[PDB]
Amino acid sequence: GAPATVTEQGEDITSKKDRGVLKIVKRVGNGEETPMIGDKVYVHYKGKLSKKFDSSRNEPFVFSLGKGQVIKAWDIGVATMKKGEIAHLLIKPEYAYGSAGSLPKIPSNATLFFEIELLDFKG
Ligand SMILES: CC[C@@H](C(=O)N1CCCC[C@H]1C(=O)O[C@H](CCc1ccc(OC)c(OC)c1)c1cccc(OCC(=O)O)c1)c1ccc(Cl)s1
């Protein structure tokens, strides 16, 4: 399935190259620009543990990139995305909720999978 495909063919986009955040591009986006730190980003997404599933396609999910507003894997991964791109991210716990988790929904040491569509980003 999609998480296995990410494992096998996904690019390690971590600085440390510890396979903490693996990405595959599922739909190529437009042009070359990708967001900078501070940019306001607009996405649609859904995600799941590697059993819990959550989906945000009415209002976009909005955040400012690279400011610690989301889990580290998203500050890393969304930064790499072009407008219009859909990507899969497989995420080890160090780049998500770690040992504390986020109970009850997210257990300790959870791996997370997300499908993310970057709709737009603005300065
Ligand atoms: C419902 C939780 C969601 C989830 O894990 N996220 C939601 C979508 C973005 C990725 C990730 C997330 O960062 O959750 C964060 C959770 C809180 C959090 C923020 C920063 C963090 O580190 C810097 C952090 O680390 C533990 C946790 C979140 C959730 C809702 C909104 C939000 O920012 C916008 C705002 O506050 O209005 C951010 C998942 C969906 C399916 C999963 Cl399995 S986990």
Quick check: 110 and 104 in contact, CB under 8 A? no
Domain housing 97 = 1-123
Distance CA(96)–CA(57), nearest Å, equals 23
* Residue spans of alpha helices (H) in 2-119: 2-9, 72-78
Cis before 35 (ω within 30): no
Q: What is the resolution of this structure in A?
A: 1.4
Strands (E), 1-123: 11-12, 21-27, 40-49, 53-55, 61-64, 86-91, 112-122
Q: Are 56 and 44 in contact (CB under 8 A)?
A: yes
Q: Which residues of 16-48 are buried (b: 16+ CB within 10 A; e: fewer)?
A: eeeebbbbbeeeebeeeebbeeebebbbbbebb
Residue 76: C-alpha distances to residues 1, 22, 53, 107 (Å): 23, 10, 22, 22
Q: How far apart are the first and last CA of the chain?
A: 36
Return the bridge partners of 47, or none.
Answer: 54, 114
Give CA–CA dist 47/66, Å, rounded: 20
For a pocket test of ligand 1, which of 42, 44, 64, 71 has the largest count of ligand atoms closer than 8 A to its C-beta?
71
Number of domains in the chain: 1
Under DSSP, the state recorded for 105 is T
**Which phi-psi region, left, alpha or beta, contains residue 2 (left: φ > 0; alpha: ψ -120 to 50)?**
alpha
Query: Closest Cα partner for 87 from 119, 110, 122, 49?
Result: 119
Q: Closest Cα partner for 72 from 7, 120, 5, 13? A: 13
Ligand 1 is surrounded, with C-beta below 6 A, by 47-49, 52, 54, 61, 63, 68-71, 74, 97, 106, 112
Tokens (6 digits) for 123? 């300065």
